[PDB]
Paper text:
To assemble Pol I ICs, we used a double-stranded DNA scaffold containing the Saccharomyces cerevisae core rDNA promoter from bp −50 to +20 (with +1 denoting the TSS) to prepare the Pol I CC, and a similar transcription scaffold with the same sequence but containing a 15-nucleotide (nt) mismatch (bp −10 to +5) to prepare an artificially induced Pol I OC. Nevertheless, we obtained a CC reconstruction ([name]) at 3.7 Å resolution. The Pol I-[name] complex is recruited to the promoter already bound by CF to form the Pol I [name] where CF is in a distal position (compared to Pol I ITC). At this stage, the DML/expander and [name].2C are present in the active site, which stabilize the Pol I open cleft conformation and allows Pol I to accommodate dsDNA through interactions with the clamp coiled-coil. In Pol I [name] (a), the CF is bound to upstream DNA in a distal position from Pol I-[name]. At this stage, the B-finger of [name] and the acidic loop of [name] are not yet resolved, the cleft is open and the DNA-mimicking loop (red) is present in the active site. [name] and CC2 differ in the position of CF and upstream DNA with respect to Pol I-[name] with [name] being rotated out by ~15° compared to CC2. CF and upstream DNA bound by CF pivot around the TSS region, which is held in the same place relative to Pol I-[name] in [name] and CC2. We therefore cannot exclude that [name] and CC2 are rather two snapshots of a continuous movement of the CF-upstream DNA module with respect to Pol I than two distinct [name] and CC2 states.
Numbering used by the authors:
A (entry chain R): 1 to 38, 121 to 324, 345 to 385, 397 to 443
B (entry chain B): 117 to 688
C (entry chain S): 16 to 68, 170 to 215, 219 to 306, 316 to 335, 343 to 515, 531 to 555, 569 to 649, 656 to 779
D (entry chain Q): 86 to 388, 405 to 453, 469 to 514
E (entry chain L): 26 to 70
DNA sequence: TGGAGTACAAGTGTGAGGAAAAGTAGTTGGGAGGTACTT
DNA sequence: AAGTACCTCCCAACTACTTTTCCTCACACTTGTACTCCA
């Protein structure tokens, strides 16, 4: 039922989804000469858009320069029955050497009738068949508040050859919520960003199967979601350590200047460092030239994200916390 | 994947302990209306052990055994293909202080050129060296001198003095004429310097017009771009060459120092100022390893910009792609240009050759780095403590550059130097000679001198050896009497070693020069900058530990044992 | 106001973390990590009842076929009858005709004067929009969708003494443009295949599409999925599909492409929550709670969540709960393929800084997949809530309430036929079995009498006698003709072999006969270790092989013994394979295949390498 | 450079013997195990070679050019099936269609660990026949049986002995009934047959069609329990099975237990999605699942950039990180197969019509679809199984 | 048996031909040779 | 009782598709850099 | 020879549509062999 980590190709289903997207390739070149006047056959469709690289969808904020007036030419029976007369006269030539349901699959989707038949649930391979049932069971007691068992489903899941990148890292909360004799959970995202430490450019043009980019690859202009999660995993775990002067040195090495938030979490590694140390046990020259640094760090680490892209902060009382840290010393 | 390499591993492999050089570029175009940011790779350059950038930095001796080094690891050197090498320190002239050299090796340059002159070495705040020699002529016409790439240029001084701030010629004149009209050696030598220029350049009246001519003849040897007018070339000459202690926003203050490098010079050709000896450990400083290494790394990314442009100059030979908002055409360029700064920097650390298509301000191009041998532990520690006087001075067999000199007291060891050919050129530092690396803060000190009896520079209109010119780092700011700065050299010392303001550092040297009959030029000279030689002494009133340079120590009476402290003489 | 955002969107997917920090060190947890602490929460259904009533595909244009929402009539404005709860549900042969008071349970009205109003063009939409929350009164009319036209009702003049609800209807205009209209919502406002419109709905009950409009048609929206709302009451509409958002002010000229989502999402609902600022989206694997901007209220993209499952039929309903410090939001995604729900707990605040708490799941009736579910908004940390149900292949409208603290049609029409021609035929066959069940009920009883007795001591050596002679016939049956190269019957006695009652002897007499052939030409097999597949467990001896068959049917057998006794002895003569020859009959057959099978066929018959 | 490289998809005839070489060595692995745990004797192994020695001749009688040897993974099931119905074993194909969904004998993924030397010289178009491609569905095990007893005379030369006293007796113990049902079905099988006793198996030599007469010997025995399950409590004046007994008759049997046969029954529901309530895995308990997750510990014995995943092994240990349930825990605390019988008989302790015929019809929903999962057929192929049993008995008594 | 030493993780792994010059318990490159029982003789001077 | 008309016993005939690993191959990340061109 | 011409020197992201050709059956044509209103 859940979104599965299986890389499996099928003969009859990879035809019929080519036979799906090539049906777009004749209903969109008719509409080129409807909205204007009035050798692989999939790659033309993907170059018609821009791949997101941020989330599941590519977005734009609204009250912007993205504006255009609405078409008022109504679309009716005299223009809709003619957008699909030219494909079915010519896209019926693969329909006579395909399988007997690649006719069935294709006629139904022009007329509503979304499939009850999802592909990887009857596949009965006995090895990608064991994966499907275990994934519903994986989320089951997680959504029922019982962590002794769903923690122990996962180790059996990651010894089956065929599992993929999605289920690896996002539900590592089962170590986060063991806590009695735990593995501490932080050394997990160390290794997960170790061997997957690619700085490859976002390839943007492959025919995307078996994965989705915006959670699990290390492409540029927005870094890995298995990378910035490690910082937020460790930093509140650094606040629970009461290693601040050992953790701001781990932003010191990577040159992730392809993003904005990774400097704001670095705009608090030296903020909270100046929380305990800006008391100094006074109630006396030694930490005065240490506190007075550890705010000016934050003064151009909060600014350095204001130099970067999208990160909207309430800049009135964030500064008022920072100004008041040096009023502690007076 | 990207794993953590340790310098134990780079010794086994016999490879160089390199760190990859990130270098992002700003390919902007069309009055900067399109802007491209390309963090591009430039090869690995070797990195110093126990630097910031080596992994051994904040590392326990217990953990140095965990990663297989000696428990008392020295560091501070390079591993160049297994051979442990380091950049030798060299002795160069003190920054930002106009020396008063006499030199018979000026008479080679032509007839009527004298033997005297003023030499300054203004460093830039990014450690770049630049010498502005100021000669003297029998004719009276003082000729400024500098070097831009590999050549030697001569200009009349008033052409600069007209160009620095917007002066009339009497504003130039009475600028020099502070007092001492009645001296017939000021008021007559000064005439031909003004009379000749009005005769030589009658058609160059004001500063906007003198920059029309100065950026004209120095246009194409500076390789400036055709969008820049002749004044904007000339302003860039005035911001790249003459007195680069400030650069821009100091074109008033760069004027007030050339009024000081002439009134010194006229107080030399009469002989009221005895000439400074550059060997004497008081006008010479230390050129460190990294500060040299941070100049050649600036030079090699100046030879990288000019090669990208040379590639586009190889694209004007085609009509191939005139496409400068194009993304891929920039990649078409830089996948062809030699962007390997890897073995361009390591080649400096292998052979010792200081290759430069531009050219530094130093005079030799070899022997900059050696082999840190390991034949015992005494030999290996003394590489880091050695300093070489300079590779040119092996020519001069006059032993003045080789002799033990009294200003080496506490800075250079009188004993520890080898015998044989470099016996004297290869003398080491002392047990406590600690060197300033960062500079200090000077945003507080001028507010303290004006709080004392110092009149400011602009309001005053005075000069001469008979007053005391107060300077900080080659920035003339004041004028007082000789008994005034005689107290300020005690007053600033109390205000320093006690806890008054964090703006006053303790590495600051207070070089008060007392006035003397035909001796060194009197003045009160402060330096706080990079690359000085400092050692700890014990200051007797308010008894604290004090820091004293080799320029203060020429005029102090520092006792040795407290059995031998006399009265009214020893402050330290 | 929130600190960790981007502006394109605002992230918190399932169970990983959040990305923000307010940093308020005032002794009260100086961090606002969204995964907040609470006690455990589990939802318990309350079973009740409310009322009564191609093969590999399922259509998107069918959305709703039942409704019950607090909508008020026209006549209760001067009277203080504060809001009504009326019923409307589809009925008929294929569901075309259309026809309460929350006392303790949710049930049909008490004097059942429902009007089964006749509709000759069938039902695919039973839905009201309601009104806005800050206008002063409720709406009083509902427009639905028929397969031929577009009808308009009116909720006027309901009473109390008769519990009667009538409507006054406007005549529907048919499809002048013959395209299937998708969803109606008011907020003759329509969504036909191709285009949209706005209409001034009339004000009489006895007796217009405005003169500016536009289209919505897309070629590469492969489904016919559409759904429409309005945005924030100021002349702005929202037209959706599986693909994008169409925001039109029909007075201005401004089209907006915010949700560019033909890439990896499939929008399966769009729902306007009653607070007009926070509007929810529940498309493909996404759960967006995108709010409104205060500068220009056109859209804010706010706190969103992923949806982990991979279902394509997810509807949604969202019920607010107004508690004195936070504002609750849920999400019911129910399937016409399966039973699972997947929900959230949100807490909307005033300064637009709102978090989530966790996810939780409930299931349904096993027989049927839920096809229609609506909340009960109730006149507007003990997480109690309630909702109605309706399922596919289940036309029985139950009631359930989530508090905090089935035979198939392939069976019934076949078995127990109405044949009078053969009524007593099987009817005698239930007395044919007892004619031999009780023929064989007393022969065992005489064996209950004789237990190791003397006239079956007659039998037991005769059982040795007639099972010792007729073995060498079948051991000299194939000695003359052993060269076969081209069996074990053991039914040689013919008395009954069923008139002797001893468990420890007849096993140990056949096993006594096995050792009698310690010579060749016969191979015997065992029973203590071969015969275990009934018991699913070890058999050390045959006394306790039978005893687990004897300690299992004590009461349910007729007096525990007589049917149990001839179970195992039957299996003894059903496992009567004891007369295969010795090894020299298979092995010389194995060499005729190894040698007439040529030099390719040696290694073809080859075990023994690992 | 070609001297180092071999095994390159090019083997002409020896590769056609590779599946004739590999598929007896894996056969050697399968029945040697059946003596070890499934307790079948020395006469279970000696039988199963000549069965394989005349299945080579089944291909060798066809000509060598364009031979297209028709075999499957169910071939080693079907030559094991001949070591069952000739050997007079009480076994039924429930005990082979389910114990491969527990995968006790090495049937699934017989390429991965079983040969250890005969993988690399395989062309990749017989690779879908040597390993665990799919599971046999909708009677696919019952269709290779037509290839088995059919071309060579398994009748005449040997005996087709579904021990018909057993599947009746097996279904007695499968669902906790009074043992009068063991003899109730006796005069039902013996009334729809010509030459009444000792049914035989369907063979095939000419056709390509599944049996619409449904002449499989075991499949007919499966239908024979399906009307006598309806008779004794609705066609009954005797009313011996009482009226309070009906409530704990169906729903007690439709209640999840945790025996070693009922946990292993659940994976048939996992592998086969087709039948309803095959997705009933959501309603497990803790020790019902740790047995399933230690059922994985017999799944995983068949089923330089590798030391990185060693750290994934290291940070996720299969055993618990502190005090698992192995050493200092229960010796004998598992509920057995002689318990869920006897507990329900302790539950159905009472012993001494429209509200009855509907309340017996609940039992028709359970056990006539409990038959469906224990053999993995479809309910529309249950309808081919029914429609030749009742009308012919309607045709034979008249 | 001829084996070698991983310099990094200190794990004695042998080396056949047509193999990577690597470690296999860690992923290290530089790898050093161990000694076995072999007769060497010395004067005690 | 002899003769039909629709329900139906009973033999053999057509093509046409799911298995999924198996290794090769679809554009731009990639991989480096002095040798190779007659205007 | 005089500084271009700029052609490439050149591997290969995750699989891209091929891909090795093997193998399970589907889905109804045939006219009695059955059970029957007019004749």
């Amino acid at each position: 039922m859940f979104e599965v980590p299986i890389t499996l190709t099928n003969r009859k289903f990879a035809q019929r989804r080519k036979l799906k997207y090539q049906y777009i390739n004749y209903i969109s070149r008719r509409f080129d000469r409807i909205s204007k006047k009035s050798s692989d056959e999939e790659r033309k469709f993907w170059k018609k858009y821009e791949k997101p690289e941020k989330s599941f969808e590519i977005w734009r904020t609204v009250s912007s320069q993205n504006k255009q007036p609405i078409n008022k030419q109504k679309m009716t029976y005299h223009n809709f029955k003619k957008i699909e007369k030219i494909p079915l006269r010519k896209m019926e030539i693969p329909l006579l050497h395909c399988t007997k349901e690649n006719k069935l699959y294709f006629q139904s989707i022009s007329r509503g009738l979304e499939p009850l038949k999802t592909s990887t649930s009857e596949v009965r391979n006995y090895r990608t068949r064991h994966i499907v049932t275990l994934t519903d069971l994986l989320h089951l007691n997680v959504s029922r508040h019982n962590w002794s068992l769903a923690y122990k489903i996962f180790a059996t899941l990651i010894r089956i050859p065929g599992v993929q990148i999605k289920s690896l890292w996002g539900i590592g909360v089962e170590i986060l919520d063991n806590l009695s004799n735990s593995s501490s959970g932080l050394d997990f995202l160390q290794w997960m960003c170790q061997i997957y430490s690619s700085k490859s450019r976002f390839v943007q043009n492959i025919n995307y199967r078996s994965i989705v980019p915006p959670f699990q690859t290390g492409s540029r202009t927005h870094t890995a979601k298995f990378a910035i999660t490690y910082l937020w995993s460790s930093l509140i775990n650094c606040q629970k350590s009461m290693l601040i002067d050992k953790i701001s040195e781990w932003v010191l090495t990577p040159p992730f200047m392809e993003d904005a938030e990774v400097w704001f979490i670095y705009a608090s590694c030296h903020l909270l460092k100046a929380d305990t140390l800006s008391r100094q046990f006074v109630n006396r020259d030694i930490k005065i030239n240490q506190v007075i640094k550890h705010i000016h760090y934050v003064r151009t680490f909060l600014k350095i994200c204001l130099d970067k892209g999208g990160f909207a902060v309430p800049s009135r009382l964030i500064e008022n916390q920072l100004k008041s840290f040096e009023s502690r010393l007076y | 994947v990207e794993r953590k390499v340790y310098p134990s591993e780079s010794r086994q492999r016999l490879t160089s302990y390199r760190g990859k050089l990130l270098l992002k570029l700003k390919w902007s175009v069309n009055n900067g209306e399109e802007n491209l940011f390309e963090v591009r790779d430039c090869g690995g350059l070797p990195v110093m052990l126990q630097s910031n950038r080596c992994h051994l930095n904040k590392m326990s001796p217990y953990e140095l055994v965990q990663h297989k080094e000696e428990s008392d690891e020295i560091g501070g050197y390079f591993i160049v293909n297994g051979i442990e090498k380091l950049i030798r320190m060299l002795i160069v002239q003190r920054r930002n202080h106009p020396m008063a050299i006499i030199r018979p090796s000026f008479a080679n340059r032509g007839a009527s050129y004298s033997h005297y002159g003023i030499q300054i070495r203004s460093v830039r705040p990014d450690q770049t060296s630049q010498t502005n020699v100021l000669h003297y002529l029998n004719d009276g016409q003082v000729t400024f001198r500098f070097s831009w790439r590999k050549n030697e240029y001569l200009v009349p001084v008033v052409m600069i003095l007209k160009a620095l701030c917007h002066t009339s010629d009497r504003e130039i004149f009475d600028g020099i004429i502070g007092n001492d009209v009645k001296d017939s050696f000021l008021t007559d030598r000064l005439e031909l310097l003004l009379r000749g220029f009005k005769k030589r350049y009658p058609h160059l009246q004001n500063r906007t017009q003198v920059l029309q001519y100065l950026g004209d003849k120095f246009r194409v040897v500076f390789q400036a771009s055709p969008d820049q007018s002749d004044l904007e070339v000339g302003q860039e000459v005035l911001d790249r060459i003459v007195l680069v202690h400030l650069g821009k926003d100091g074109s008033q203050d760069k004027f007030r120092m050339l009024l000081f490098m002439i009134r010194k010079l006229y107080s030399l050709v009469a002989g009221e100022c005895s000439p400074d000896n550059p060997d004497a450990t008081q006008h010479q400083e230390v050129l460190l390893g990294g500060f040299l290494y941070g100049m050649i790394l600036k030079e090699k990314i100046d030879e990288y910009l000019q090669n990208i442009i040379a590639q586009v100059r190889m694209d004007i030979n085609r009509g191939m792609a005139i496409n400068f908002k194009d993304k891929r055409y920039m990649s078409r360029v830089l996948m062809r240009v030699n962007e390997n700064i890897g073995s361009k920097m390591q080649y400096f650390l292998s052979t010792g050759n200081l290759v430069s298509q531009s050219g530094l301000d130093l005079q030799q191009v070899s022997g900059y780095t050696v082999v840190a041998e390991k034949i015992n532990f005494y030999r290996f520690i003394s590489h880091f403590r050695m300093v070489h006087r300079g590779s040119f001075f092996a020519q001069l067999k006059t032993t003045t550059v080789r002799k033990l000199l009294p200003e080496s007291w506490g800075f250079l060891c009188p004993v520890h130097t080898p015998d044989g050919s470099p016996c004297g050129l290869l003398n080491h530092f002392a047990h406590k000679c600690r060197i300033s690396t960062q500079q200090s803060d000077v945003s507080r000190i001028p507010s303290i001198l004006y709080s004392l009896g110092v009149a400011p520079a602009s309001h005053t209109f005075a000069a001469g050896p008979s007053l005391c010119c107060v300077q900080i780092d080659g920035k003339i700011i004041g004028w007082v009497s000789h008994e005034q700065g005689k107290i300020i050299a005690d007053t600033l010392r109390y205000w320093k070693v006690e806890g008054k303001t964090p703006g006053l550092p303790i590495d600051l040297e207070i070089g008060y020069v007392p006035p003397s009959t035909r001796g060194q030029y009197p003045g009160l000279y402060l330096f706080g900058g990079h690359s000085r030689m400092l050692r700890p002494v014990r200051y007797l009133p308010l008894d604290k530990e004090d820091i004293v340079g080799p320029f203060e120590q020429v005029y102090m009476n520092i006792a040795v044992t407290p059995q031998e402290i006399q009265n009214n003489v020893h402050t330290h | 106001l929130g600190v960790g955002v981007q502006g394109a969107s605002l992230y918190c997917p399932q169970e990983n973390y959040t990305t923000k920090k307010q940093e308020k060190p005032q002794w009260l947890r100086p961090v606002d990590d969204t995964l907040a602490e609470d006690a455990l929460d589990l939802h318990i259904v309350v079973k009740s009842l409310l009322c009564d009533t191609d093969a590999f595909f399922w259509d998107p244009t069918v959305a709703n076929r039942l409704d019950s929402q607090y909508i008020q009539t026209a006549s209760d404005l001067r009277n203080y009858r504060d809001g009504t709860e009326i019923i409307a549900y589809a009925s008929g042969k294929t569901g075309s005709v259309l026809n309460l008071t929350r006392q303790n349970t949710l049930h049909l009205n008490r004097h059942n004067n429902v009007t089964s109003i006749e509709l000759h063009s069938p039902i695919k939409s039973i839905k009201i929009p309601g009104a806005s929350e800050s206008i002063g009164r409720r709406s009083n009319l509902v427009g639905i969708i028929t397969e031929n036209s577009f009808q308009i009702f009116r909720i006027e003049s309901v009473h109390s003494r008769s519990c009667d609800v009538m409507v006054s209807s406007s005549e529907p205009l048919y499809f002048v443009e013959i395209d299937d209209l998708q969803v109606v919502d008011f907020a003759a406002i329509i969504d036909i295949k191709g285009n949209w419109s706005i209409g001034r709905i009339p004000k009489n009950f006895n007796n217009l599409i405005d003169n500016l409009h536009g289209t919505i048609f897309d070629p590469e929206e492969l489904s016919s999925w559409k759904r429409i709302e309005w945005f924030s009451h100021f002349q702005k509409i929202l037209v959706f599909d599986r693909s994008k958002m169409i925001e039109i002010d029909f007075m201005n000229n401004w089209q907006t492409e915010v949700v560019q989502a033909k890439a990896w999402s499939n929008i399966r609902d769009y729902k306007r929550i009653d607070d007009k600022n926070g509007i929810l989206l529940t498309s493909r694997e996404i759960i967006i709670v995108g709010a409104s901007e205060s500068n220009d209220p056109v859209r804010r993209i706010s706190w969103k969540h992923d949806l982990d499952p991979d279902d394509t039929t997810l509807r949604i309903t969202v019920q607010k709960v107004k508690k004195p410090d936070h504002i609750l939001l849920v999400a019911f995604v129910y399937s016409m393929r399966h039973k699972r729900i997947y929900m959230h707990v949100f807490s909307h605040r005033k300064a637009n800084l709102f978090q989530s708490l966790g996810c939780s799941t409930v299931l349904e009736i096993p027989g049927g997949t839920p096809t229609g579910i609506e909340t009960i908004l109730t006149l507007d940390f003990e997480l109690v809530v309630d909702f109605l149900v309706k399922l596919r292949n289940s036309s029985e409208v139950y009631y359930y309430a989530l508090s905090n603290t089935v035979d198939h049609p392939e069976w019934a029409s076949l078995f127990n036929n109405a044949d009078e021609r053969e009524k007593e035929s099987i009817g005698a066959l239930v007395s044919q079995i007892k004619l031999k069940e009780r023929e064989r009920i007393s022969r065992v009883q005489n064996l209950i009498e004789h237990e190791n007795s003397h006239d079956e001591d007659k039998y037991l050596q005769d059982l040795g006698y007639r099972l010792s002679i007729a073995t060498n016939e079948l051991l000299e049956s194939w000695q003359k003709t052993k060269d076969e190269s081209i069996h074990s019957k053991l039914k040689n006695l013919l008395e009954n072999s069923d008139s002797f009652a001893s468990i420890p002897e007849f096993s140990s007499l056949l096993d006594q006969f096995f050792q009698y052939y310690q010579d060749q030409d016969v191979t015997f097999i065992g029973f203590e270790k071969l015969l275990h597949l009934f018991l699913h467990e070890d058999v050390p001896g045959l006394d306790i092989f039978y005893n687990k068959l004897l300690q299992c049917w004590v009461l349910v057998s007729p007096q525990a013994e007589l049917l149990t006794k001839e179970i195992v002895k039957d299996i003894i003569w059903s496992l009567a394979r004891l007369e295969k020859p010795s090894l020299f009959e298979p092995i010389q057959n194995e060499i005729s295949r190894s040698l007439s099978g040529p030099y390719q066929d040696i290694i073809s018959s080859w075990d023994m390498d690992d | 450079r070609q001297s180092h490289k071999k095994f390159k998809k090019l083997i002409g005839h020896e590769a056609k013997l590779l599946f004739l070489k590999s598929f007896q060595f894996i056969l050697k692995r399968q029945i040697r195990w059946l003596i070890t745990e499934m307790r079948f004797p020395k006469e279970f192994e000696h039988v199963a070679k000549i069965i394989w020695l005349k299945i080579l001749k089944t291909i060798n009688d066809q000509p060598q050019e364009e031979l297209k040897l028709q075999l499957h993974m169910t071939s080693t099931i079907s030559i094991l099936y001949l070591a069952s119905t000739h050997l007079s074993l009480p076994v039924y194909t429930c005990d082979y269609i389910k114990w491969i969904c527990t995968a006790k004998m090495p049937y699934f993924q017989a390429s991965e660990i079983l040969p250890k030397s005969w993988r690399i010289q395989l062309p990749n178009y017989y690779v879908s026949i040597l390993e665990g491609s799919i599971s046999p569905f909708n009677g696919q095990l019952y269709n290779k049986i037509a290839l088995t007893c059919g071309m060579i005379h398994f009748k005449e030369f040997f005996n087709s002995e579904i021990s018909c006293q057993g599947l009746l007796l097996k279904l007695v113990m499968q669902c906790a009934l009074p043992p009068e049902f063991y003899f109730y079905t006796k005069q039902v099988i013996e009334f729809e047959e010509t030459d009444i006793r000792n049914l035989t198996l369907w063979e095939r030599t000419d056709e390509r069609h599944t049996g619409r007469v449904s002449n499989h010997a075991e499949l007919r025995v499966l239908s024979y329990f399906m009307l006598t399950i309806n008779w004794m409590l609705s066609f009954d004046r005797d009313r011996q099975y009482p009226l309070k007994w009906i409530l704990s008759l169906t729903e007690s049997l439709t209640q999840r237990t945790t025996t070693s046969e009922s946990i292993g029954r659940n994976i048939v529901k996992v592998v086969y999605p087709d039948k309803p309530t095959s997705s009933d895995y959501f309603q497990w308990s803790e020790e019902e699942t740790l047995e399933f997750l230690k059922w994985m510990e017999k799944q995983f014995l068949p089923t330089d950039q590798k030391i990185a995943r060693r750290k994934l092994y290291k940070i996720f240990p299969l055993d618990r990180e502190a005090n698992h349930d192995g050493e200092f825990n229960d010796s004998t605390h598992q509920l057995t197969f002689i318990e869920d019988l006897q507990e329900r008989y302790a539950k159905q302790t009472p012993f001494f019509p429209p509200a009855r015929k509907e309340a017996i019809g609940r039992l028709l929903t359970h056990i006539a679809s409990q038959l469906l999962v224990d053999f993995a057929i479809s309910k529309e192929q249950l309808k081919d199984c029914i429609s030749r049993i009742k009308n012919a008995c309607l045709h034979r008594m008249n | 048996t001829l084996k070698y030493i991983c310099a990094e993780c200190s794990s004695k792994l042998s080396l056949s031909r047509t193999d990577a010059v690597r470690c296999k318990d860690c992923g290290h490159r530089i790898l050093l040779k161990a000694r076995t029982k072999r007769l060497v003789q010395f004067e005690a001077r």
